[PDB]
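Inputs:
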Amino acid sequence: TREYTINLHKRLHGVSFKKRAPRAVKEIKKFAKLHMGTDDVRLAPELNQAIWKRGVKGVEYRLRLRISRKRNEEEDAKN
RNA sequence: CUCUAGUGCAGAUCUUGGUGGUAGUAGCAAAUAUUCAAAUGAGAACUUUGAAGACUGAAGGGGGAAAGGUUCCACGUCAACA
């Protein structure tokens, strides 16, 4: 595990306001690829409600996540 | 061995049909956010189910007549066809 930061600044600047956060969760998918080096990407409904609580126009910038490597044999699920 | 007829095709912005052409290009149906997990499986964003959010609520709620007429329903199939 690392305890990570997810700064949701860029890719949220230039995207529509009322449909901002559905593009922002797609960045939570991107981040998992490089910084672990995994084939599969996996989130949870725990990370759906990690943004959406303060909904779409407002967002969490300081959205600091966790990650853990297994599922089947190896894969990183953000958990 | 000689007589007889609906008797020679390139064409009236024609006529009987396939095939070419733009072209695998545009279109892909009025701007009401979607994210994530499962059931089943040969294949799953779409069936179906759960977690969660957008959305409307003088109607996305409710409900009768004309008109149509079994399209509902359960059962049952993935070929043509969306």
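The CA atoms of residues 19 and 69 of chain A lie 31 Å apart. Flag for discussion at group meeting.
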